[PDB]
Amino acid sequence: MGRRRSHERRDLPPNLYIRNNGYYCYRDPRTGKEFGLGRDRRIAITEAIQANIELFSGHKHKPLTARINSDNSVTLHSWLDRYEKILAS
DNA sequence: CCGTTTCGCTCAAGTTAGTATATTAAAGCTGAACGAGAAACGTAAAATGATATAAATATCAATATATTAAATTAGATTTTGCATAAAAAACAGACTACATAATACTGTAAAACACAACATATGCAGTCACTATGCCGAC
Numbered sequence: 001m002g003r004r005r006s007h008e009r010r011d012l013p014p015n016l017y018i019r020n021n022g023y024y025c026y027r028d029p030r031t032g033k034e035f036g037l038g039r040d041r042r043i044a045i046t047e048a049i050q051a052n053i054e055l056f057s058g059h060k061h062k063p064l065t066a067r068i069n070s071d072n073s074v075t076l077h078s079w080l081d082r083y084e085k086i087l088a089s
Numbered sequence: 090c091c092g093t094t095t096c097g098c099t100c101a102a103g104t105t106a107g108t109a110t111a112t113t114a115a116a117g118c119t120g121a122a123c124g125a126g127a128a129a130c131g132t133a134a135a136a137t138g139a140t141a142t143a144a145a146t147a148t149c150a151a152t153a154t155a156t157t158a159a160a161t162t163a164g165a166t167t168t169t170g171c172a173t174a175a176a177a178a179a180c181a182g183a184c185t186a187c188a189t190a191a192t193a194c195t196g197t198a199a200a201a202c203a204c205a206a207c208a209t210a211t212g213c214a215g216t217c218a219c220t221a222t223g224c225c226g227a228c
Contacts, residue, residue, distance in 0.1 A: 021212070023213075
């Protein structure tokens with residue numbers, strides 16, 4: 001992979017970059033080069049967004065096996081089970 | 090004696106009957122840590138119980154007679170409780186004199202930055218290689 005995922009990519013489209021000088025670039029699916037898009041975040045992002053298309057349903061993440069995860073997991077039944085206990089008190 | 094069916098029971102999902110509180114305000118309860126003076130104890134030293142026997146000293150009744158400590162007065166006086174009042178010193182109530190800050194006003198250097206023509210390294214702009222398995226193709 002070489003770079004894998006990084007931290008700045010966490011909030012940037014697939015074909016988008018982010019140099020050291022807070023600048024963003026536009027990758028090219030022909031040779032691998034890139035150009036200069038914008039200085040802002042949502043601006044450079046939206047640009048790469050309208051380039052190919054938006055994200056998807058959720059998140060990709062597909063290395064080789066798996067790793068730690070700490071996302072959202074709200075549920076009604078789960079709450080209800082905790083509610084029945086509070087009632088007994 | 091034993092099996093079979095009805096009946097007493099409790100679990101599970103609808104159908105009704107009843108009563109109504111939150112903050113202020115000020116305590117009251119109780120586990121746990123905090124800080125000295127007096128007497129029961131105990132080993133050690135001083136006074137006393139132990140112990141006995143012929144000789145020395147005290148035990149005491151019954152009454153005369155000189156002696157004396159000391160409570161009982163009785164009058165004398167330091168001692169003790171309580172102010173009164175003025176000489177003497179403290180200290181606000183005045184006031185000008187004196188040295189000192191806040192302020193009144195003039196005199197002068199210079200901080201702080203816009204404005205404007207250049208000068209140019211450096212970040213950004215644009216393209217190819219570095220570095221190593223995908224994908225696609227065979228096994």
